[PDB]
């Protein structure tokens, strides 16, 4: 979470993580959710909206990040590592932001 | 840079790297902590 | 063949007449040397693969000499060529695109006013001279007590070496060696008498043969573009050049006596 805290996340509008807690590949998804919902990310910018969608029969975790460059980053993370998702999101928002 | 025979970190930000056949204590916070094993 | 950026041109073999002054339009005064191109003929042509593997070689002969003092082989070569024997025979390394048929004469109009050249010749051989005149070593004082040491070189080596090093400067032959001066600018080109005015000192005594070539300095490597690439052919243009080709800064003999403003 320190990476997203020091990267200046002021340039994001909405981050939603849609998942189902009763699946078998939600570890990295919930890790990413906590890393983006940490207190430092919140204190970096207060205008952002963090949403955690919880379902039971979706069976497909996903992350949608809409930011004001007219950009929509969609990551269907079902087998990717939480660290890989975090570093990819960081590189993308640092390249376009 | 300081050429020494025994390198040692001076703060928690110095990292030891093996380069050019020697050891180098590199510090980004305090640049005066740059040490090189002779 | 057309001119190329990585191409070179053949040189000449002239006769050093003497020295003269030459005033520039800015009021300055330079010293020129007169080189007379008496007879320049391409004797033989050696191919690139047969000479160096990188550049072809052209053989150039100097002025005319007598048949009654050359050997059988040289006279046979000149008989098969159809030309009288030459005194000095030199080799010029040129590219494979600037080759000329052997037996072709060359003229001092080969160069144009404003250019840099190189000059090679044997300097004035002063014979077996002392070290003070050869290398410039300082001598000992004259009369403060020195006995038979007014011009000795002194110590020649050290003690523990128990010998002298091969590069030790010592009295020996001085002067008779092929030396080359680079980057000499040419001012005036006389077409009638085939005289070239080369700036600066030219190594070699007067009335001697001198090998002139294009300046191989890196600052003047691509200056052969506006000049005639193969050589100066007086029959190709069907036009006679002026008597004296002056540079853009040489104060010509006929001048309005320029004054500053």
């Amino acid at each position: 979470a320190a990476a997203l805290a020091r990267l200046g996340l002021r340039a994001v509008k909405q981050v939603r993580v849609q998942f189902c807690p009763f699946e078998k590949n939600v570890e990295s998804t919930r890790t990413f959710l906590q890393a983006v919902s940490s207190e430092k990310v919140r204190c970096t910018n207060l205008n952002c909206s963090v949403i955690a969608d919880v379902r039971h029969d979706g069976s497909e975790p996903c992350v949608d990040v809409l930011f004001g460059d007219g950009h929509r980053l969609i990551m269907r993370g079902a087998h990717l590592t939480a660290q890989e998702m975090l570093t990819a999101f960081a590189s993308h928002i640092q390249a376009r932001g | 840079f300081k050429t020494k025979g025994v390198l040692k970190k001076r703060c928690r930000d110095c990292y030891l790297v093996k380069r050019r056949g020697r050891w180098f204590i590199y510090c980004k916070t305090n640049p005066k902590h740059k040490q090189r094993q002779m | 063949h057309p001119w190329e950026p990585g191409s070179s041109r053949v040189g000449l073999i002239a006769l050093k007449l003497g020295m003269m002054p030459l005033w520039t339009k800015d009021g300055q005064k330079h010293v020129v040397t007169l080189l007379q191109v008496q007879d320049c003929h391409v004797l033989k042509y050696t191919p690139k693969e047969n000479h160096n593997g990188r550049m072809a070689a052209l053989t150039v002969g100097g002025k005319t000499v007598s048949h009654f003092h050359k050997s059988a082989s040289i006279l046979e070569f000149y008989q098969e060529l159809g030309l009288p024997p030459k005194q000095k025979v030199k080799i010029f390394n040129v590219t494979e695109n600037a080759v000329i048929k052997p037996g072709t004469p060359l003229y001092a109009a080969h160069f144009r006013p404003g250019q840099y050249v190189d000059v090679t010749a044997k300097t004035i051989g002063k014979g077996f001279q002392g070290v003070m005149r050869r290398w410039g070593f300082k001598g000992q004082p004259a009369t403060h007590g020195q006995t038979k040491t007014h011009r000795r070189p002194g110590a020649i080596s050290t003690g523990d070496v128990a010998r002298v090093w091969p590069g030790t400067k010592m009295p020996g032959q001085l002067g008779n060696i092929d030396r080359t001066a680079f980057g000499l600018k040419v001012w005036r080109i006389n077409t009638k008498h085939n005289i070239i005015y080369v700036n600066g000192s030219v190594p070699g005594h007067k009335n001697c043969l001198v090998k002139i070539k294009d300046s191989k300095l890196p600052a003047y490597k691509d200056f052969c573009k506006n000049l005639p690439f193969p050589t100066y052919f007086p029959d190709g243009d069907e036009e006679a050049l002026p008597e004296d080709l002056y540079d853009e800064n040489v104060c010509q003999p006929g001048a309005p006596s320029i004054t500053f403003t």
Binding site: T81 | - | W165, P166, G167
Partner: protein
């Protein structure tokens, strides 16, 4: 066996031309057999006073191979005699300047330290690549074996042998290469 004296002597002390490939070969192991064949220590009729010597043609000299980091550690120091003319050329720089010089100096060192060294060196022929004139090629008799077995690359192995070589470990599917 029942030859005349002159042809028997000629066949006994005849000279032989050998071939030696130096591609991916150590200069030491090359110069070993090179000096052996030069001195003639492969003939039971060898003697010091006799001039029994054979010619060796070493090809693919530029493609020589040094073991270890000698390419950057080993130096070849020469001196022109003049003061300050003491040059120390790295092995790589010397090989880049002249590809023959490496194996030439190796053989010149492995040969004995007598006057016959120049004589038996004049019988040596070293070529950087496989560009041998015909008058030299038509002299070869046989080719000596390579002293070092050249190891295969990964793409040089056949797929049947690749599948014959068993898999040691079972990688998990969740990992990313």
């Amino acid at each position: 066996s029942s030859f005349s004296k002159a042809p028997q002597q000629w066949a006994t002390f005849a000279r032989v031309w050998y071939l030696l490939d130096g591609k991916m070969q150590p200069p030491g192991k090359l110069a070993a057999m090179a000096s052996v064949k030069l001195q003639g220590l492969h003939k039971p009729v060898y003697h010091q006073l006799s001039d029994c010597g054979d010619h060796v043609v070493i090809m693919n000299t530029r493609h020589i191979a040094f073991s270890g980091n000698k390419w950057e550690q080993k130096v070849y120091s020469s001196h022109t005699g003049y003061p300050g003319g003491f040059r120390q050329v790295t092995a790589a720089q010397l090989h880049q300047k002249d590809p023959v010089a490496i194996v030439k100096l190796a053989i010149y060192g492995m040969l004995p330290k007598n006057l016959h060294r120049r004589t038996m060196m004049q019988r040596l022929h070293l070529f950087p690549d496989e560009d041998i004139p015909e008058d030299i090629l038509k002299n070869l008799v046989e080719e000596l074996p390579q002293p070092r077995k050249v190891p295969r690359r990964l793409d040089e192995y056949t797929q049947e042998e690749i599948e014959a070589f068993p898999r040691v470990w079972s990688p998990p599917e969740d990992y990313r290469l």
